[PDB]
Amino acid sequence: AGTAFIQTQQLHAAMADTFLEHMCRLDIDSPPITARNTGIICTIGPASRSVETLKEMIKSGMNVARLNFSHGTHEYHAETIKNVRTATESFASDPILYRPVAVALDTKGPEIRTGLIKGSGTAEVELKKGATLKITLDNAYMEKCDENILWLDYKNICKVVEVGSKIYVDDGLISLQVKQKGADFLVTEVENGGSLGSKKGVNLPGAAVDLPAVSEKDIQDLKFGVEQDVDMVFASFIRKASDVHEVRKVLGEKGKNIKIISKIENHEGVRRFDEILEASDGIMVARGDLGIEIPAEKVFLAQKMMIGRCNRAGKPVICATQMLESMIKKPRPTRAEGSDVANAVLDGADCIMLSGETAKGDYPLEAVRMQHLIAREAEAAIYHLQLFEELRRLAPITSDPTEATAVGAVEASFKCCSGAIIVLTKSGRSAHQVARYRPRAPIIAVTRNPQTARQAHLYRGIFPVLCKDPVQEAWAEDVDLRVNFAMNVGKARGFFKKGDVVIVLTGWRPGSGFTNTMRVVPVP
Amino acid sequence: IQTQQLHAAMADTFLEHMCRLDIDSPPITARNTGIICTIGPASRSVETLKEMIKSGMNVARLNFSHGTHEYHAETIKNVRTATESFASDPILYRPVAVALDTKGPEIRTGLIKGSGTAEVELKKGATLKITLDNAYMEKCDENILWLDYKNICKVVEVGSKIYVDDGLISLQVKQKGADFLVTEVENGGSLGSKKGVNLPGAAVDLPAVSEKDIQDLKFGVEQDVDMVFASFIRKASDVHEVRKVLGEKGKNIKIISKIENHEGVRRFDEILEASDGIMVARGDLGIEIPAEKVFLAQKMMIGRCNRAGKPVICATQMLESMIKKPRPTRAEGSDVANAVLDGADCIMLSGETAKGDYPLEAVRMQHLIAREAEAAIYHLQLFEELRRLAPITSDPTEATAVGAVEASFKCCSGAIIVLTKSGRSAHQVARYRPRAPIIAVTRNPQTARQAHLYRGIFPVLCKDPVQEAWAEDVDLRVNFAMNVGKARGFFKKGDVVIVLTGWRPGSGFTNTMRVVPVP
Amino acid sequence: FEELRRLAPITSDPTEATAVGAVEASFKCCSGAIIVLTKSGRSAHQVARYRPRAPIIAVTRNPQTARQAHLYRGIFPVLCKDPVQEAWAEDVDLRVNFAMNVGKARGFFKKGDVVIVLTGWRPGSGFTNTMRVVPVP
């Protein structure tokens, strides 16, 4: 089998009257009665790169493999991809057990990195609380950083910063307040002490950081992605609509189908969220990176807002960073980490992304299993009913065949207590339009296009499944084949059993543009 | 000064309401969730407390796990001195409650071999013998370990876990015995002297009130505390014995039951019924039940307390980084917020304020987070659901109380002013979770303090003498609250507020609602 | 009622907000009546506008308003000829207890049922702003 593969459901429990009443019925002692619908993106790196590790991670519920292009060469990551694809395809000899797995390319982005600390690349220095530290743009100091002077590469840092602004260094381990501006320098006072190292990430709280959207390194990384046929791109440090447009433009005609997830990493991104969301295919709320750049008592408000708007607009949203960080060192997570993951699933996220945990952790395989366990337990606390009733009200009244059918499918999934909604689809769009309305039941999305099978994991509650059977001549039999394929998948997964009811979305003519034909089918 | 800016028309759907959250605009609502600070070494002084009350402390907790009766008597005296410093202007007088947190029943280990402070390495896979023989009680080491709980052999089976030093070390039982256990170390660590032992999912049959606590609870009654946080509650009869010890003399002292273990969560319903309120101790649960199921417990317990209309308090692991640092982490702010949004009435700061380097900033961040989180609450559905789920009765007070909340939404009221002796009339309003603050006016100083337990009650102590003409005595107290509310910033000249009063001085019920424009 | 409440325009008028709450409560308490003290009749009309189930016993000293009230549905007007008591609170209690006796005689309610009562607070305050839930003596 796998560990995470057999998610048996026990549908037909009549859903509660009110959201309050639903919380009151949560029994921690009973097991979860629902498929884990929230996708799981694991970052691949040193500890999980091998073909044998990946096989077990896919079995334990990995869906997307992220590659971090901040570090490593093109040759290095080409083999990381080859290993993912070998591991994924190991299960292909039984199409029922074949879970597809996506490949994500996370850009380096624009960044502000410090210089090399005095006697060699690895040596640190103590910045203590209240000491003066000079920041310089003069390249003479770029391998001569110490307690007193610090280089960094961003040449317009003097222009976007004023007196009194903060500068967070090494992902907010150290924080500095500017006392005096200058021609090509700043004089700062250390507030939070720490061990400063070589080439560390600097952030500039609420500054219009005017770097290029796509650095010249990234223009090569994005072409490598297109060349390697990645499925999605996590574009870093997005500030505005035109940043996303230039990420699109670089991918071009050749990789137009590659999905662009914009990462909201800074204050400017959150302010311009609406224009970014419109231009982006999805969103990634990078919480740790926001925690530097905006106040701690306002980050949860940003997360909720962004997750909210993405749900309304029907685009994926991903909750990244600071998920299960203790599992780099330890075999289990803390109470507060499990609660943090849960509350992100309940806020409405589609996917959860494990950063260090799986890339360079001592426990990469258990990290996936805890993520899976938390996401499935959290699923029981979701009151799917109001998510839907609100999403139906807020949607604009149109006479589109597909969207009216898609709603009715979800509608019926509640009234029939359906085990699933089976959706036949080439592009994935028909399945996405169903998932937009947040059903309780899993959406088994059947397809022949292998990319759409991979790209589907971005959406919540879609279980993609790749049909490799040849197209039957009689159109009606080709449907019956693919439907009966999903029936067998769903029975094997445990979503439903002999004699339950499921909803099925299909076309009517092979040639009709729309997925317009809904039917209520009892399971053979 | 929590200025409100009422009259913003509330959103259509909860989804739409989340979508309207702008982090850049300031919060448009009074911080309704109470703040309980634990007083200790860093915050004990009269001068520290004055600034903490100013920055939004409501309840002062005293931890009776540590310290003497003489020590805590003076901690209380300092709270009362600081509180009363503001009494010379009754408009600015915020009352402040005193909470007595019991030690409880516990399982403590012995003293490690050569001295009280000296550790030993338990390594992963080594055998460790647990013993009830008192000969070893000051001779613990890598091999043998004493502990005081004499029936430990009876409640544990082969294969059960034993977490030691608040879950730093964990041991699996291999062999039971007459008066011993043989365990295998799973999580290694530095074992010390007198450490807390827990027994995951065991019917731990210790006394509900230890003999130490029977003296601590009489000291509480003697010092006129306002509430008692009873520790390690497992079942209804535990709460009943905490009640029985307080007795006739301290019958008015509120008993908040702390749910610290697996058995408490299983029997939550019977405990909630017998308790005045609840405290979800999250860190202590995180030891005894799995980490992927604690948030489910918190949500359930906070849920049921909201339904039943009793206070619930979210304690432990709130802002722990602020022991050492002047600000909290992103994840701590999010953890506090999500507990306010889950539906908690109060938030309790443990170390942060007791023995922290930054006790005063810890209160200010708690206040800031709780006020920002307030904007994310969709008060409307909380109410509509609570109204539906409530049982149909023709009680005068409860029907009036609902109508007051009802009207608080339709008039976009700045407040609900409630006159009350016992506090009950104000509690019945707060039960239905209005958006507006509830200014609860009273002459009884204890009810003013005990009100902070409930969410959205702003208690205020009227020290004026009782006017002969009953109607003027009402008008006085109402106009007192009007001035408080204007000073706080809850509302201004020309806004509307709801006012609950009696009709006869003698009528049992708070039955008279009126919609009043602010003079 | 639920439709008439939705379609009504949101205002912070004391009288209209009280009047709705009176009807609201008339359903939740299963009230036998809504007793309304009124000179012009308007306070009773504003209650009747929202179409309660319970009868509205409208108490008044103005004999014309007692007659003109029959136009409105569910108002049972009743003319109090007692003189105005000096203590305002007793003058209310008189008129309320007058309607209680009318309502018991009509059969609208009996000893121990609940009724809603709309009054003023100051003799001088423009609004009928004071609602109370009263058990029948």
Residue numbers in the entry:
A (entry chain B): 8 to 531
B (entry chain A): 13 to 531
C (entry chain D): 395 to 531
Sentences reproduced from the published study:
Pyruvate kinases (PYKs) catalyse the last step of the glycolytic pathway by transferring a phospho group from phosphoenolpyruvate (PEP) to ADP, thereby generating pyruvate and ATP. M1PYK is the constitutively active form of the enzyme and despite the high (96%) overall sequence identity, M2PYK has a low basal activity but is activated by the allosteric effector fructose 1,6-bisphosphate (FBP). Each subunit of this homotetramer consists of four domains: A, B, C, and N-terminal. The active site is formed by a pocket between the rigid body core and the flexible B-domain.
Phenylalanine and alanine were the most powerful inhibitors (nearly 100% inhibition) among all tested amino acids. Although all three tested inhibitors show a similar inhibitory pattern on M2PYK, they have different IC50 values: alanine has the lowest IC50 of 124 µM compared with phenylalanine (410 µM) and tryptophan (445 µM). Co-crystal structures of M2PYK with alanine, phenylalanine, or tryptophan show the amino acids all binding with similar poses in the amino-acid binding pocket (located between the A-domain and C-domain of each subunit). The carboxyl groups of the amino acids form strong hydrogen bonds to the side chains of Asn70 and Arg106, and the amino groups hydrogen-bond to the side chain of His464 and the main-chain oxygen on Ile469. They adopt a binding pose that is very similar to that observed in the activating serine structure except that the hydrophobic side chains of the three inhibitory amino acids cause a widening of the binding pocket and make contact with the carbonyl oxygen atom from Arg43, effectively pushing away the N-terminal strand. Binding of the inhibitory phenylalanine, tryptophan, or alanine stabilises the T-state structure, each protomer subunit is rotated by 11° relative to the R-state structures. The X-ray structures of the inhibitory amino-acid complexes show the N-terminal strand pushed by ∼3–4 Å compared with the R-state serine structure. The repulsive push from alanine, phenylalanine, or tryptophan leads to an interesting hydrogen-bonding rearrangement in which four Asp24-Arg400 salt bridges stabilising the C–C interface in the R-state switch partners to stabilise protomers across the A–A interface in the rotated T-state. The C–C interface in the T-state conformation is held by hydrogen bonds between Asp487 and Trp515, with the indole side chain anchored in a pocket further securing the T-state conformer. Measured intracellular alanine concentrations from various cell types range from 0.4 mM to over 4 mM, which are sufficient to inhibit M2PYK activity and stimulate (cancer) cell proliferation.
